[PDB]
Amino acid sequence: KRKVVLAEQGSFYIGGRTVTGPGKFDPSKPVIPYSNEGATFYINQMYVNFQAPVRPRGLPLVFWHGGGLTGHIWESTPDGRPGFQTLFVQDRHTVYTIDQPGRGRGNIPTFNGPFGQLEEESIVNTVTGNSSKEGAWVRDRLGPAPGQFFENSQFPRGYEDNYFKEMGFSPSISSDEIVDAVVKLVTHIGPCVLVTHSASGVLGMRVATHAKNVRGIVAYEPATSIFPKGKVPEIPPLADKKSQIFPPFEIQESYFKKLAKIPIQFVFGDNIPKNPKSAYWFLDWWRVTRYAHSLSLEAINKLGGQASLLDLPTAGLRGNTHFPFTDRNNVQVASLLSDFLGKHGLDQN
Amino acid sequence: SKRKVVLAEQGSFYIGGRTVTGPGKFDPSKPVIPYSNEGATFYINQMYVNFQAPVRPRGLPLVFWHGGGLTGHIWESTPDGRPGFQTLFVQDRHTVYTIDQPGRGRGNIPTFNGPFGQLEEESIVNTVTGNSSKEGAWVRDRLGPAPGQFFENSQFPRGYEDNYFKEMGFSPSISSDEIVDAVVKLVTHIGPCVLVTHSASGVLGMRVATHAKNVRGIVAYEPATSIFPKGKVPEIPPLADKKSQIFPPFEIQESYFKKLAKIPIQFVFGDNIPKNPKSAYWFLDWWRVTRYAHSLSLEAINKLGGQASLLDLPTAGLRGNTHFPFTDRNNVQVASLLSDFLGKHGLDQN
């Protein structure tokens, strides 16, 4: 069903700071072309969109897009089917969707001058990085090479252009400032559940260690593993015997231990190889990254936690990509998220 | 104040844009990170589109098109969290599209692996950016004559300055032709519709209408650039400082300009635009001459048989509006005047 009944909806900005240019502002002088003189710039703020059902039940859900993405990925699939925003408002949760600082409606910190530069200060780097379609195809495990699909794929074929059009670059905002914005949002919302994806996986783990209001985490294919400082286990290189996964993030154990106090689930899709795949770099990367996450969850459980890894094929769902929540079976993926929320009492008031 | 909204459906999609390519071939066995332009296809200049459809809509869908440096947020909520025009017009039984144009918000910002906007030797957009300060925006938007000051009658949601200015940012140097192209494609996709524009999207919406007969009406909140038939720009005075000018008017071929005479067009202006020259307040004076230029543009449309009008909100009994009347404290009354325009032309009936 596509129908939704909203008690209220809207959006707002939260977080960020200001930076200032030199000199003072004279309203009698030409304002355009724009100048840094006398300037205050608001930078690194985050965009937040909320939709609240009638008679909400349980905690609000905060959906946090992966790297180079926006809240669009929770609104609709590339072929136009309802995304998790609609599905979970229908499931009677208030739903927040964010565009983190540096992405989408979040702030991209640039001024009058070379990109990211405020006079002599580099706020973000002028040189950007950004995946190609080809790199994203293999990262997302549509298939082993660009243009090729795994036979079992749940990707909405024929909507490749729509899908890749949602992706873009991120400026070099410090991860600390991204975590800060979401901590401030969590303080504003109250008790809530973070639903993260890829790059926002590690960021959501960090937010939870700073914000007792985070009462649970579901992370779709997190990209960076997290461990207590000085307790990173041995992680092998890739099958090329040259490359490594993303360097695991290390946090003080007193913060890491907060992860044991809430239910945490990492969700993985299909077509991650069991054995080394030297011919397919990103397939092998996912093999080792998933392994690293298994050790991270184990470390949480050894501190008394309740941290689990859900492989969708074990639940009977075959062919999911790195975006299970926009795949053809995303309704079934959503049902498994509702199951997690229900078991942990996160769907009751 | 009235917050409930009932949607038959909602969602979002990407439309428009093109692809550009890097050199060489992509090898899936080589490290994919750090990202490389080698063998790369990049989708650039695409537009983000959100839609919310009421149950049993009445009349044409509305396409709300944010001003310069903005996003669809400005139609979703006001800075103090009151309902924006998206909610108000779904409640008014129109399907509502809100866009983030190419280069803004969820639209594409075309950059790659290299200095901003550069794909190897090709400059897609400039590496040097421009962006208003808070102070520049304060005076541009006519909150008051100088930063920190408010006009006596102001409808701005005072106290929410941080929320308001946080919504604004830079735009890369995407060609206006490609922004117009994306919206033409959207209008082809949705069918007959009304464009509701603001500031920088004023002139872009006029251009879209000349390329898309599905545009059945335009309401433009304080358009920033005037439009005239080629070679027929009237005399427009410089500003009171004797050296500055308004934005150079856009000139289009007469056969395209004439298409603007076939649909109802309304330009809406807020308050505190001076009648006489103001050399001490550059943006106030800029708005005086810009509004004058638009009055001449509308007259040119009407002399060709058009249905063009200028609504000064104070004349309608609304005092104190800023450059964003649709997020001001009286935005419900502003919305009522938009509903009036739609009703007058049957754009609220099936």
Numbering used by the authors:
A (entry chain A): 12 to 360
B (entry chain B): 11 to 360
From the study:
SulE was overexpressed in E. coli BL21 (DE3), purified, and crystallized in a space group P21. The asymmetric unit contains two monomers. SulE is a homodimer, consistent with its oligomerization state in solution as determined by gel filtration chromatography. For each monomer, residues 12–360 are clearly defined based on the electron densities. The overall structure of SulE monomer contains a catalytic domain (residues 12–27, 55–112, and 185-360), a cap domain (residues 113–184) and a protruding β hairpin (residues 28–54). The catalytic domain is a typical α/β hydrolase fold, with eight β-strands (β1 to β8), six α-helices (α1 to α6) and two 310-helices (η1 and η2). The cap domain (residues 113–184) is inserted in the loop connecting β4 and α2 and is composed of two α-helices (αCAP1 and αCAP2). Particularly, a β hairpin, which contains a lid loop (residues 31–51) between β9 and β10, is far away from the core region in each subunit, but cover the cap domain and close to the active center of another subunit in the dimer structure. His333 Nε2 is hydrogen bonded to Ser209 Oγ at a distance of 2.79 Å, and is responsible for the activation of the nucleophile Ser209. Glu232 Oδ2 is strongly hydrogen bonded to His333 Nδ1 at a distance of 2.64 Å to correctly position the imidazole ring of His333 for catalysis.
SulE, an esterase, which detoxifies a variety of sulfonylurea herbicides through de-esterification, provides an attractive approach to remove environmental sulfonylurea herbicides and develop herbicide-tolerant crops. SulE catalyzes the de-esterification of a variety of sulfonylurea herbicides, such as MM, BM, SM, TM, TrM, EM, and CE, to the corresponding herbicidal-inactive parent acid. The structures show that SulE is a dimer with a lid loop in a domain-swapped β-hairpin covering the active site from the opposing monomer. SulE shows a similar catalytic triad consisting of Ser209, His333, and Glu232 at its active site.
